[PDB]
Curated annotation (Swiss-Prot):
Job description of the protein: Plays a role in signal transduction by regulating the intracellular concentration of cyclic nucleotides. Can hydrolyze both cAMP and cGMP, but has higher affinity for cAMP and is more efficient with cAMP as substrate. May play a critical role in regulating cAMP and cGMP levels in the striatum, a region of the brain that contributes to the control of movement and cognition.
Family stated for the protein in its record: Belongs to the cyclic nucleotide phosphodiesterase family.
Protein name: cAMP and cAMP-inhibited cGMP 3',5'-cyclic phosphodiesterase 10A
Subcellular locations according to the entry: Cytoplasm, Cytosol
Binding annotation for 3',5'-cyclic GMP: 68, 269
Active site residues per record: 68 (proton donor)
Outcome of mutating residue 107 to N: Reduces activity 1000-fold
Name of the gene encoding the protein in the UniProt record: PDE10A
Subunit note: Homodimer.
Amino acid sequence: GLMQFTLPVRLCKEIELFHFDIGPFENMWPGIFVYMVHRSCGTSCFELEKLCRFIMSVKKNYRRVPYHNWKHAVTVAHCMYAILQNNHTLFTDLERKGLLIACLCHDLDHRGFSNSYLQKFDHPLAALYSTSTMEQHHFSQTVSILQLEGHNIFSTLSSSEYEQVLEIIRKAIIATDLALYFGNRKQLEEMYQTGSLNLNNQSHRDRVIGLMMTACDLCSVTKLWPVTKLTANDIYAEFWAEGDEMKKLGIQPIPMMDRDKKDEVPQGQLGFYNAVAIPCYTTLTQILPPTEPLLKACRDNLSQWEKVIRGEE
Ligand SMILES: Cn1cc(-c2ccccc2)nc1CCNC(=O)c1c(C(=O)N2CCC2)cnn1C
Ligand SMILES: [Mg+2]
Ligand SMILES: [Zn+2]
């Protein structure tokens, strides 16, 4: 009860900032997560023993892939932490409980392959879940781990509160399917610009949380340039392996996944910042003004990719 987690001073200060990098000491990431839960939710939200057991089972069910790994899970949770702490009063008790957990679980048991590769390979998951194939799997893995003995971190919630938190987690994890982000953002843009956006409207809150999920998921573009750049290497390491696997099925992969077209990565980043990232953080900033630092950091990184194209690095 009187047992707080406390971090070294540099981490205590910098964890509050959007651009925080959780660092290369894997063994500190559980502690960093518990710290964020305690500050964003409270020391009372979860039984520490159940929470620690839950976190260590989640870690065990992330695979040793270049990008969609346990570090990504904790990085995405930290971005969510920063959003929630900078928007103190906008979110419910159930939302603060559910969203950090959703973020920690959102890529559970990821294999480093896209929904599209699973459908072309004809993976069993593609027959079980025809759309948002991996994201339905991630939610399924979340429920599995919640149902392990001594892993029920939500055990103090009523039946209907428990159903609501699991429904927040489900929608939040499904929203990380980037195929769904375009339409979600277009609807939020229209709603914001016609003044019809209503945070008492559950379907509106769902849309806003979905956009927070995209923002946290893509948050490598909001880090300091060296973090952003070195993260992109891990992203492409996965894409190019998928490209190799597409060539093994007799399918030319898209250029994003073809290691033979490495040279076009910089132009590929420009399209991604302009089509996906900047629009994401712009709409998020319109709805939640204190998230501006994400938009600002994303624009700084777009400017760095522009410099790469000009051979200024
Ligand atoms: C759209 N496009 C095209 C090219 C390209 C490259 C070489 C040659 C031709 C085309 N590169 C990109 C963008 C790469 N995507 C990212 O970098 C990315 C993601 C991301 O797509 N998701 C899915 C799992 C994570 C998340 N964060 N970030 C930074
Ligand atoms: Mg994912
Ligand atoms: Zn992710």
